Design a protein around this motif. Structure first.
Motif, short mmCIF file in Angstrom:
data_model
loop_
_atom_site.label_atom_id
_atom_site.label_comp_id
_atom_site.label_asym_id
_atom_site.label_seq_id
_atom_site.Cartn_x
_atom_site.Cartn_y
_atom_site.Cartn_z
N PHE A 100 0.28 -1.20 0.30
CA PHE A 100 0.11 -0.52 0.19
C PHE A 100 0.74 0.83 0.26
CE2 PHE A 100 -3.83 -2.20 0.61
CZ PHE A 100 -3.62 -3.31 1.54
N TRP A 134 -9.14 1.49 -8.57
CA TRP A 134 -7.50 0.73 -8.08
C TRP A 134 -7.96 -0.63 -8.21
CZ3 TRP A 134 -11.14 3.12 -4.92
CH2 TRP A 134 -11.77 2.01 -4.10
N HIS A 150 -10.53 6.46 -5.41
CA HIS A 150 -9.71 7.98 -4.32
C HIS A 150 -9.33 9.36 -5.11
CE1 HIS A 150 -8.55 3.49 -2.58
NE2 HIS A 150 -8.15 3.95 -2.16
N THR A 196 -13.43 8.64 -1.69
CA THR A 196 -12.35 8.13 -0.55
C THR A 196 -10.84 9.27 -0.93
OG1 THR A 196 -11.36 6.64 0.87
CG2 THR A 196 -10.76 5.97 -1.60
N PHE A 227 -2.53 6.73 2.60
CA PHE A 227 -1.24 5.46 2.93
C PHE A 227 -0.63 5.22 1.75
CE2 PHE A 227 -5.59 3.85 -0.24
CZ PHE A 227 -4.75 3.38 -0.46
N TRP A 267 -10.58 4.58 5.25
CA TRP A 267 -9.86 3.36 5.03
C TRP A 267 -8.30 4.22 6.21
CZ3 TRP A 267 -5.07 1.17 3.08
CH2 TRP A 267 -4.97 -0.50 3.88
N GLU A 280 -14.12 2.32 7.33
CA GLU A 280 -13.73 0.86 7.11
C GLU A 280 -12.43 -0.23 7.53
OE1 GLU A 280 -12.95 0.73 2.57
OE2 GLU A 280 -11.47 -1.54 3.08
N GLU A 299 -15.90 -4.84 5.10
CA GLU A 299 -15.15 -5.53 4.18
C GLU A 299 -15.35 -6.88 4.00
OE1 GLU A 299 -11.31 -4.30 1.25
OE2 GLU A 299 -10.64 -5.99 1.71
N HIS A 301 -11.37 -8.16 4.99
CA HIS A 301 -11.66 -7.92 6.47
C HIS A 301 -11.85 -8.33 7.77
CE1 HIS A 301 -9.43 -3.53 4.08
NE2 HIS A 301 -9.05 -5.01 3.60
N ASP A 341 -18.14 -3.51 0.89
CA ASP A 341 -16.70 -4.06 0.13
C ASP A 341 -17.08 -5.13 0.03
OD1 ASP A 341 -15.82 -1.13 0.21
OD2 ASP A 341 -14.05 -1.75 -0.24
N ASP A 350 -14.26 -4.30 -3.70
CA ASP A 350 -13.21 -4.08 -3.68
C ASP A 350 -12.41 -4.69 -3.90
OD1 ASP A 350 -10.08 -3.00 -3.18
OD2 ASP A 350 -10.88 -2.73 -0.93
N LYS A 397 -8.51 -7.56 -6.11
CA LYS A 397 -7.56 -6.95 -7.15
C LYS A 397 -7.70 -8.49 -8.34
CE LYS A 397 -4.84 -4.33 -4.14
NZ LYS A 397 -5.66 -3.84 -3.66
O1 LIG Z 1 -9.48 2.36 -0.21
C1 LIG Z 1 -9.62 1.45 0.26
O2 LIG Z 1 -8.56 1.04 0.01
C2 LIG Z 1 -7.68 -0.16 0.15
C3 LIG Z 1 -7.12 -0.61 -0.42
O3 LIG Z 1 -8.59 -1.04 -1.86
C4 LIG Z 1 -6.31 -0.12 -1.90
O4 LIG Z 1 -5.26 -1.42 -2.44
C5 LIG Z 1 -9.04 -0.84 0.89
O5 LIG Z 1 -9.80 -1.41 1.24
C6 LIG Z 1 -10.47 0.54 0.69
O6 LIG Z 1 -11.26 0.45 0.67
#
Ligand SMILES: O=C1O[C@H]([C@@H](O)CO)C(O)=C1O
Ligand SMILES: O=C1O[C@H]([C@@H](O)CO)C(O)=C1O
Ligand SMILES: O=C1O[C@H]([C@@H](O)CO)C(O)=C1O
Ligand SMILES: O=C1O[C@H]([C@@H](O)CO)C(O)=C1O
Ligand SMILES: [Mn+2]
Ligand SMILES: [Mn+2]
Ligand SMILES: [Mn+2]
Ligand SMILES: [Mn+2]
Ligand SMILES: [Mn+2]
Ligand SMILES: [Mn+2]
Ligand SMILES: [Mn+2]
Ligand SMILES: [Mn+2]
Lengths: 387, 387, 387, 387
Positions: A26, D16, D54, D90, D94, D137, D181, D217, D220, D245, D287, D289
């Protein structure tokens, strides 16, 4: 009461440890890149005995043979200037995108051939620089989904890779052994050979098992919630503790690589007790990352605490085993009996022994306390210096 | 579209599974004790192929030889009446207080001798009843504190115990093999040989390794966060999957023993895919506990869902591998290449091959997608019958 | 350098802790039942300040009113004889089979009414014996499967139960407050209100929130891999730390209830630092189980180490905060700045401040090291008495 | 039997997510950067309803106001061209090194002021683009060591930050709400407000609680081993599920962000059952990847499976609740009784009711089975389409 390392303590560090720029999933790097020769100099001043490297830590990926020889000569001058050794080397088979599905167990055959060629080139360099141990961490060997990887086929390819490496070494006459480093997950969803036991089991199927041992890492077994001293004891029992990676980890989460002594501090105590009492004589290697909160002063502070914490724990473990009251507690808890054969008299005598069954008083035996809690508080008092 | 088991599906159950009274660390039994011969009858009606037992499930601890022979005769009549088999047996070395520090690795030597005598007596019975596999679950072998157990000494005692058992079997001429069942913790703070890999590694140090394999349990590897299909693949690769325990587990917590299919349902799919495609031919054994919320109707409902879920997953895995679109995806993801030797041309040819290194285009190779996500959604669609 | 508790240290123990017979999911009791009045006497001799109880620890389930009054009179005589107090009491809503689906959130309404009546009867006794805090641990409130429990409906029933209890106390004029004890799992597959944060959030929806706080337990937050000192800090911040349960836990597994100081020893240090520096003034209660390996000598040894370890950690935390070099490190790491308001100048001033954005030098700020690693090694040196 | 999303399903994606280049802690990017306007176009073709961002996803960090306005105009044209919405926005607090110790709870005050200014600038943009929800977050808010962060002081600073943000919104007259979050760890060793319950509890101490809810999420809560549907039920019960999420996670390890439906597939079923039966009407946001094994074809395949899996699970959950045999099972298990008040008759009537205690037959009540296992196999059969 201080705790100063010397090169005789056999403390080593990877270039990539104090060299970690602080890029995480991150966030961007928080520190500039270190020159390897600066790291060699700074670690020698803190009392380290040597350093270790991935190929790509020392020689930038894609370097020409001219640049390669340059990087190596500068490095070698810093080792000559400091008396630092290089006891271990390894290959980067994880960073480059080509390794996204693995090195030795990549589905693409051409990639697997390339992984082996990249490895063999670095074994020759490692030998030149005097390394005794070559580590293999297959961090890209595994899967995020069940259909992506046939694991029988992937172990076949893993065995094939390590056998060819064993053939190479023996044909060259090199005095180098291999150490496989397990990790359960991260960066792959699941990594093949995920623990010490899986790596030990795999080794027994190689063509030349005596060439291969394990390089266990504190935080990696703890990522599976396993007892790290117990896994080291099994590696010692098998004769396969070739090398060790020391660091700290707070339980089951991402791989933290905290300095040694952070994380599970009682596990660290029992680890040092075991290495010292088993007479482990390899490097005490730190595979850690200074938190990205830190500047270069915090880097060298963190590397120094690795060594300090090992030496404090060494002193407390030694005081523990040397205490007469502890030796008495150990007898009270029948650790002496654990070390005696169950049935040296043999099977037939066991079978004929009525005191082992027909006339065994199970209620009297059940009633005997183990006295483990008094033993464990003596260990606690020794760790805290409250003794 | 129904999913009826027959004895040809090789489904088995322990007496202690449907027989679990529902006593947990915090609560009293919620169900009355079942007679073994009632359980044999009810499981035969649901389509099971056989049952398994601990010594103390079948014959009450401390039974006289007269009572022993009575219990066995009633049991044997129920098997004759139902056609049920007994493919596996095991020893209770965990319930009685005498086993509070272990059986084979208890610090007290007399206890260790007693554990071996209790085991040998039950091997003779198992052989009489026709079992082919003898399971060893050392749930009391381990420690809550570091000073209580020297693990090298404890592996010495464990090896000694299994070697004597191997000597016994071969001297009697019995056709029985041993299967070690790993578990990482519970009821001990840490259990020795905590995973499949640790058990496989240990076996390779016994005097007669060919007598011993593993009995992995779904929920036990998942208590360490490990991929159960991956560990089974390694057991299959080593030739050591002698037996298997099927159940469900929700992640890293106490041992739930939920019915098979509960817990991690995608892991269950990939497990069935692997057992079926590797042609595993041992028992499909359920080591599960019907939740203590249930009455006897809920007991038999839970045992039936074990079998149902296996058969549904078998059908979906078979449809997955038989789908032409899947076979095409598997090629797209280079699973065919994973199965080919990396370097059948040998080391010297590898070394001389410029296409493996000097002229390898690493950026073209890196750029190739693995197409795993399309493969994994086809697997998903097949599991859900959305295909 | 010794560490002797006195009743002024406010150390308390449940009857069920030193009274645990050692029955676990896999084994029979290893110790005989203790008389409550023996436990009161032995704990007073070790320096404890008081004891706590479940209703059913003190008065056997199903006792007649004549037997009830007998049990209570004997108990009361032992407290008078020792000067021991009873600061907390609670209800057993988990052992009896009737509670197999919960007490306050049981699906059967009649059970839920019975749970409330059983609770109210014990609040009257607790008040008589002088308790200030009434704990609620809903260990049976939850589910093994998703369809078994509508959680909105179950929170409605939980809120209803606690509101009625709050109505009862206020109508009786009792000076007693409630403390909810979270646990994430075990014995239910998932337990409702599984952490400190879930319990704090729930409290804010009760009719009289000021009557309710939390009773966090070390090992219970650690069963979710959470930082126990961080959760206590949030409970302190909300004003809701009514009571605390001290013990040790090795990571994410079954609930071990090891003596305090075992488990995560650095977490224990940071916990004691926080309780002492926040000036927590409630009981220091031990909810622990002496391992079933132990006889009664090992029971009292374990209870004594609970207290010892608290006192050693208290001394080391105090030496840490009092060290000038530490106070300097804390400033180096800007802990003083963390305690200052971000924007006491208010929103409009923040918006108009160009040094907060337009002219903020983000690279200079980024480059400042936090110096956390030097701080953390000073903490380490203090914990180990290497300072 | 297909499962085609439309914009009426309210599926959204972060820039993202499909834009993740595949940089992980151990490896370089495997994919080139996507233009936001390409992602908007491709997601509209797959049936999505909108995107989220973001600040730094849309406008490169350090952009001039001229470049800023350019980026926004191109973006806005793609939304106009596709009919895509922006329901949520958002802030990136980070990535930049300045945030290495947090944004709102950074020890350096100047950093905390900068974090608030960066946030407020993006709230204005979010409002312009029509977002209804602003997510926070705090992935950098936390610590790797105990002395680095006073958590009471850090919650004070967190409360201060959110109160100022609430003051800003109300002073501007904006119709935007905040959603916090939670995440338990990673990239910090421990993150503040680590679960849904900790975030809900914190909200109740803000000056204007009605402005704030949660954005939970999937992966999480599962990183703490928690039941995600249970935590959502508590968020629904509190009225605070502002946003969600969706993704998948295999147990307690690093944050995987797998596509929705991967990971714990039965949890995904129970989640969809609950959102649909509670009538959640916010965005269904992914959310996730795409694994770095994939090329851009595998990216869009993964995003499409997110939506597909939601729609398949929606159908199976609806068939489950609509099945008469299920409705009968639900009554058998007394889910209807769970929904009835325990004591609508009030406290005094409860106290006077002899059938609630004096004459309650606890053994008859205990003996009633809950019939949860039959219910859970009906749910299983419905999920697998075996029904
Ligand atoms: O804003 C966010 O950032 C993190 C991540 O997705 C960035 O990789 C996540 O959990 C969000 O909801
Ligand atoms: O070779 C290695 O690489 C990983 C890691 O340290 C790189 O960050 C590790 O665990 C090794 O031993
Ligand atoms: O023999 C066994 O005992 C345990 C347990 O089932 C008893 O509850 C288990 O895991 C076995 O395979
Ligand atoms: O009331 C309680 O019961 C449990 C357990 O100690 C009983 O074994 C516990 O956590 C409490 O605080
Ligand atoms: Mn690591
Ligand atoms: Mn390592
Ligand atoms: Mn089990
Ligand atoms: Mn089993
Ligand atoms: Mn507990
Ligand atoms: Mn407790
Ligand atoms: Mn995530
Ligand atoms: Mn998210």
């Amino acid at each position: 009461m201080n705790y100063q390392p010397t090169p005789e303590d056999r403390f080593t560090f990877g270039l990539w440890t104090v060299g970690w720029q602080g890029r995480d999933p991150f966030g961007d790097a928080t520190r500039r890149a270190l020159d390897p020769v600066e790291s060699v100099q700074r670690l020698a001043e803190l009392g380290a005995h040597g350093v270790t490297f991935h190929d790509d830590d020392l020689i930038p990926f894609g370097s020409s043979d001219s640049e390669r020889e340059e990087h190596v000569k500068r490095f070698r001058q810093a080792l000559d200037d400091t008396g630092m050794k290089v006891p271990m080397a390894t290959t980067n088979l994880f960073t480059h995108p080509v390794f996204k599905d693995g090195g030795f167990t990549a589905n693409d055959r051409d990639v697997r051939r390339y992984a082996l060629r990249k490895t063999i080139r670095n074994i020759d360099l490692a030998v030149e620089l005097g390394a005794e141990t070559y580590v293999a961490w297959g961090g890209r060997e595994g899967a995020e989904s069940g259909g992506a990887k046939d694991v029988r086929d992937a172990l076949d390819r893993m065995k094939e890779a390590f056998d060819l490496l064993g053939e190479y070494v023996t044909s060259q006459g090199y005095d180098i052994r291999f150490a496989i480093e397990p990790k359960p997950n991260e960066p792959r969803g699941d990594i093949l050979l995920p623990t010490v036991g899986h790596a030990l089991a795999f080794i027994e199927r190689l063509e030349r098992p005596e060439l291969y041992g394990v390089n266990p890492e504190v935080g990696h077994e703890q990522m599976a919630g396993l007892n790290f001293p117990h896994g080291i004891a099994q590696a010692l029992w098998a004769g396969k503790l070739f090398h060790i990676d020391l660091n700290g980890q707070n339980g089951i989460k991402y791989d933290q690589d905290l300095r040694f002594g952070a994380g599970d501090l009682r596990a660290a105590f029992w680890l040092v007790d075991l290495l010292e009492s088993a007479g482990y004589s390899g490097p005490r290697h730190f595979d850690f990352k200074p938190p990205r909160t830190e500047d270069f002063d915090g880097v060298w502070a963190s590397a120094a605490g690795c060594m300090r914490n090992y030496l404090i724990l060494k002193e407390r473990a030694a005081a523990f085993r040397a205490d007469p009251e502890v030796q008495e507690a150990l007898r009270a808890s029948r650790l002496d009996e654990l070390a005696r054969p169950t049935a040296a008299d043999g099977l037939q005598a066991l079978l004929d022994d009525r005191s082992a069954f027909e006339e065994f008083d199970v209620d009297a035996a059940a009633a005997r306390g183990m006295a483990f809690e008094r033993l464990d508080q003596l260990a606690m008092d020794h760790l805290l210096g409250a003794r």
